[PDB]
Write a protein that binds this ligand. Structure first.
Ligand SMILES: [Zn+2]
Ligand SMILES: [Zn+2]
Ligand SMILES: [Zn+2]
Ligand SMILES: [Zn+2]
Ligand SMILES: [Zn+2]
Ligand SMILES: [Zn+2]
Ligand SMILES: [Zn+2]
Ligand SMILES: [Zn+2]
Lengths: 286, 76, 145, 76
């Protein structure tokens, strides 16, 4: 042995033919498959052939094959085959691994829709993702948007947040609407006919209808509000509103003679108008 | 092409549309089937507000997509 | 159109007499109205002009009513839009323009600062009624003759 | 002489061959046993692509050698 120093009665391998004992012959190559890669399936003593390139020199592997067949336990002798043939498979062809199973095949076509011989599932050869016909004649990033936008839970949250920003939920029957701006504080729920405030959600009562006790102006149209409500903080100018927190093109639905039509605010901006910029700061305090 | 529209009530409807249909057209179909006036309708897809002058294809709305219907309210 | 004619006949037959209203020209769906400032209000002595637009499906949807004379009021904005329940969510086809004018006159006499359209005017009305009256009088002199 | 052919599925077959057999002949035997058309077959040995006109002995393919079968997948 070169590596461990015996001299007893196989290793006819290219550029060399050094002696190697069979206990440490196995171990060198068993390591070189289970740890190193194919380029490293070399003589330990000389370190020679150069397996970067030459294909007919890869006749070397034919000769190895027999030696490893019996010496290597089949676990690692498998890996010799696996590594070696998978090596050339991944050398620039139109070779694909199937996107779902462990199979592969040389896909020589002018097409993207590709069904797998083995598991019979289809995928895009480019994005290697399961093929629905939505993809058909669409770029990969296009289809992959569709998926993402169209998937519920994204939709669920994209909505849920939309209602976070733009919603308004009748306090009585709890029905969720989408707030049309331009209107005033006193709302009418189109489902159950209730009346209420935009800020506090406390109710509104018509003339001679307020039930809550210690009401002073029961005679009038009114509703009861907390200190917190936009109602009360709308009466503060920008000036005062600002320091509490330290410590125009908004779309209103506007009535015309034959219906309602959305239009921007149009108001002079001292980039929001006086009123809208006040609504801005009020919201942040809650 | 068929698409779905679902309201907060949980009710889902099926519309027959083409990708070239404007959002206005889709609201008109919802009015036909549900009686809701277009002026009271807000439609959303993947969190995006769908605007009247645009088409289904502008928003990449494909076959079997689901739109969300939310009713509009103005204060009084 | 028949309903609008009936309302006009009722108005003319039994003149409301603080107020007037009628078609501007040949379009029966567009009317002008006048309201005299209520007595003992800051608006007394003023004459205030309004525009009324009836919808095609009247009486099943409310008229659009707006002041065209500037007025200092918690429930009326610079554009003359009015916060009044029967003009919006409390309309019924049993309601009439005569009744609407009466309600607006009542509103002038008795504002609802709790449900304001103009927050600062609502605040002054609540906090300094005398100041509110003085300013409403100034606006009446300024824009109501 | 007997040799083995294994596919990516892991299935292994046994062929009866002689060293003088062309690669074409071997593909014909695989077709016989497996139903795979020769035009769809790529055979590899020790990382070398086996070409149709050559023989097993050209590639030093001995008794008990294992070839690898990979499908070529063809449109219209
Ligand atoms: Zn040794
Ligand atoms: Zn050596
Ligand atoms: Zn597969
Ligand atoms: Zn793709
Ligand atoms: Zn309700
Ligand atoms: Zn009260
Ligand atoms: Zn409130
Ligand atoms: Zn604004």
């Amino acid at each position: 042995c070169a590596v461990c120093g015996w001299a007893l009665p196989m290793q006819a391998l290219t550029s060399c033919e050094c002696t190697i004992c069979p206990d440490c012959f196995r171990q060198h190559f068993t390591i070189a498959l289970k740890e190193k890669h194919i380029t490293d399936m070399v003589c330990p003593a000389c370190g020679r052939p150069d397996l970067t390139d030459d294909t007919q020199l890869l006749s070397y592997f034919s000769t190895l094959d027999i030696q490893l067949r019996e010496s290597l336990e089949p676990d690692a002798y498998a890996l010799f085959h696996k590594k070696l043939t998978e090596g050339v498979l991944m050398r620039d062809p139109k070779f694909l691994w199937c996107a779902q199973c462990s199979f592969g095949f040389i896909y020589e076509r002018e097409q993207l829709e590709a069904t797998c011989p083995q598991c019979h599932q289809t995928f895009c050869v480019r994005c290697k993702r399961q093929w629905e016909e939505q993809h058909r004649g669409r770029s990969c990033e296009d289809f992959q948007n569709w998926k993402r936008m169209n998937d519920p839970e994204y939709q669920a949250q994209g909505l849920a947040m939309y209602l976070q920003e733009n919603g308004i939920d009748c306090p009585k029957c709890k029905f969720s609407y989408a707030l049309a701006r331009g209107g005033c504080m006193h709302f009418h729920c189109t489902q159950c006919r209730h009346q209420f405030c935009s800020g506090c959600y406390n109710a509104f009562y018509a003339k001679n209808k307020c039930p809550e006790p210690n009401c002073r102006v029961k005679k009038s149209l009114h509703g009861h509000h907390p200190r917190d409500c936009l109602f009360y903080l709308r009466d503060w100018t920008a000036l005062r509103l600002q320091k509490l927190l330290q410590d125009c093109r908004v779309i209103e639905q506007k009535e015309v003679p034959n219906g309602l039509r959305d239009e921007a605010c149009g108001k002079e901006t001292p980039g929001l108008c006086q009123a809208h910029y006040k609504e801005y700061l009020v919201s942040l305090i809650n | 092409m068929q698409i779905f529209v679902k309201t907060l009530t949980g009710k889902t409807i099926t519309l027959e549309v083409e990708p070239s249909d404007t959002i206005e057209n889709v609201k008109a179909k919802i009015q036909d089937k549900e009686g809701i006036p277009p002026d009271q309708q807000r439609l959303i897809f993947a969190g995006k507000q769908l605007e009247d002058g645009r088409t289904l294809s502008d928003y990449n709305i494909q076959k079997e997509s689901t739109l969300h219907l939310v009713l509009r309210l103005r204060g009084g | 159109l028949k309903r609008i004619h009936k309302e006009l006949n009722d108005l003319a037959r039994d003149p409301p007499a603080q107020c007037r209203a009628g078609p501007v020209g040949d379009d029966m769906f567009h009317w002008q109205a006048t309201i005299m400032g209520p007595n003992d209000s800051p608006y007394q002595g003023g004459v205030f002009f309004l525009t009324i637009h009836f919808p095609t499906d009247y009486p099943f949807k409310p008229p659009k009513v707006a002041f065209t004379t500037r007025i200092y009021h918690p429930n009326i904005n610079s554009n003359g839009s009015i916060k009044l329940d029967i003009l919006r969510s409390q309309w019924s086809p049993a309601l009439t323009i005569s009744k609407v004018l009466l309600s607006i006159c009542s509103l002038l006499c008795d504002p609802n600062p709790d449900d304001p359209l103009v927050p600062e005017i609502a605040r002054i009305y609540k906090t300094d009624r005398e100041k509110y009256n003085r300013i409403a009088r100034e606006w009446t002199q300024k824009y109501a003759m």
